[PDB]
Design a protein around this ligand. Structure first.
Ligand code: SF4
Ligand SMILES: [Zn+2]
Length: 402
DNA sequence: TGAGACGGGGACT
DNA sequence: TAGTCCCGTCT
């Protein structure tokens, strides 16, 4: 079992927690496009599709970044049938710059499955949503099911994890499988049976605007009377959920002692050489060369200027890049390769350093443009399915140009 | 099982 | 400044 200092053994505490959080939400909730669409869309499938898209985009992405992407998505594909007919290229174009591009592909595949195999009907429970929809894990299933279908299911995102680890003073490593089970148990216990969707959004919004990672706003916290972390700074525990013997306590960290942060290792340094090959084209030039990454691994299926991966001691070499550029353009006068500078793009796991080069041709390449290579205008590149790193490479190529 | 793969940026000091 | 933390799913 566990201690009651770590659970809500008093139903009055749960009832007060629901009413306090919901009351704060009822007078402070942020105006969001997917919240308006949900409360007015009477059709369950349409309503679930709007919630589905928002919850996928919100994965590891802040609300402020999602709002513009969600609006563009719903404008282009207002219905599941519209998304089901879209190409993966189009999805990658709209997802450009949002990050974690597998979310877009699976969102399109899932809608394609709903329309083509389920008659356009969304599963109505978190269990079946998670079972049938790719890219819909445990959070997104409970998110869709509670918000769109009123199923009484609690969810745990990063915000709820931070709120719960503080309210019940959980100081263990939150990523371990046992505290993860206890957090989802607390969420399923606390979720309001009458308003499960509004409860989950209230909990998540509380962790984004009040119970923030740094400098929380307890002077404005509605659940400050049910938080064990807050009362300590002003009932003690009897373990596996408190702070370990090696886990240090800090008087100057306040309630932010919880949750215990996991010191991440800095990303591995990788090095690459990329070049923006240009030709004058006709009207609307110049045209720049884009090639498509493999449909696996990092930035799968996106378009990029021709690049080569180099070991650190070779990061300034040209021979591998020239060999790559001659694949798509044929023979190339090599002394025209101009070094423009470097671009450092940070992934969650890779620190990539691009040595950016530029190559301006006088006319069209003598060899025919092989398949897999496209020559785009500048406007077409800015709307293409490319990663932000390549947009950084282009804007540098645009600066060092006359 | 679980620990790394998988993007980009917003908001703190 | 230039860091530092942090906003799920899958294999
Ligand atoms: S009292 Fe402080 S630590 Fe507790 S939930 Fe509210 S903001 Fe978070
Ligand atoms: Zn304990």
């Amino acid at each position: 079992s566990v201690s009651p200092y770590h659970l809500f053994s008093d139903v009055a505490d749960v009832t007060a927690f629901r009413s306090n959080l919901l009351s704060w939400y009822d007078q402070e909730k942020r105006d969001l496009p997917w919240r308006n669409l949900a409360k007015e869309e009477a059709n369950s499938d349409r309503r679930a599709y709007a919630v589905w898209v928002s919850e996928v985009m919100l994965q590891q992405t802040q609300v402020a970044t999602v709002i513009d992407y969600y609006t563009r998505w719903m404008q282009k594909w207002p219905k599941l049938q519209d998304l089901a007919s879209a190409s993966l290229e189009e999805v990658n174009q709209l997802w450009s710059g949002l990050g974690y591009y597998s979310r877009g592909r699976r969102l399109q595949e899932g809608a394609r499955k709903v329309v083509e195999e389920l008659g356009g009907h969304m599963p109505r429970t978190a269990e079946t949503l998670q079972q049938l929809l790719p890219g819909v894990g445990r959070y997104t299933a409970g998110a869709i099911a509670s918000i769109a279908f009123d199923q009484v299911t609690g969810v745990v995102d990063g915000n709820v994890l931070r709120v719960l680890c503080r309210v019940r003073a959980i100081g263990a490593d939150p990523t371990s499988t046992l505290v993860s089970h206890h957090l989802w148990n607390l969420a399923q216990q606390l979720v309001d049976p009458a308003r499960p969707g509004d409860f989950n959004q209230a909990a998540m919004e509380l962790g984004a605007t009040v119970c923030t990672p740094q400098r929380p706003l307890c002077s404005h916290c509605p659940v400050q009377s049910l938080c064990r972390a807050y009362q300590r700074v002003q009932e003690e525990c009897a373990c596996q959920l408190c702070l370990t013997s090696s886990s240090p306590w800090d008087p100057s960290m306040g309630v932010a002692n919880f949750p215990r942060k996991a010191s991440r290792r800095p990303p591995r340094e990788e090095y690459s050489a990329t070049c923006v090959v240009e030709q004058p084209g006709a009207i609307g030039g110049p045209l720049v060369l884009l090639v498509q990454r493999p449909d696996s691994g990092l930035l799968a299926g996106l378009w990029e200027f021709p690049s080569v991966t180099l070991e650190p001691s070779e990061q300034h070499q040209h021979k591998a890049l020239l060999q790559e550029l001659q694949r798509w353009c044929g023979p190339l006068p090599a002394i025209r390769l101009q070094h423009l500078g470097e671009v450092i793009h940070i992934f969650s796991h890779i620190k990539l350093t691009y040595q950016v080069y530029s190559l301006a041709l006088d006319q069209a390449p003598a060899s025919t443009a092989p398949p897999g290579a496209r020559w785009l205008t500048w406007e077409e590149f800015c709307n293409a399915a490319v990663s932000t790193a390549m947009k950084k490479v282009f804007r540098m190529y645009e600066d060092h140009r006359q």
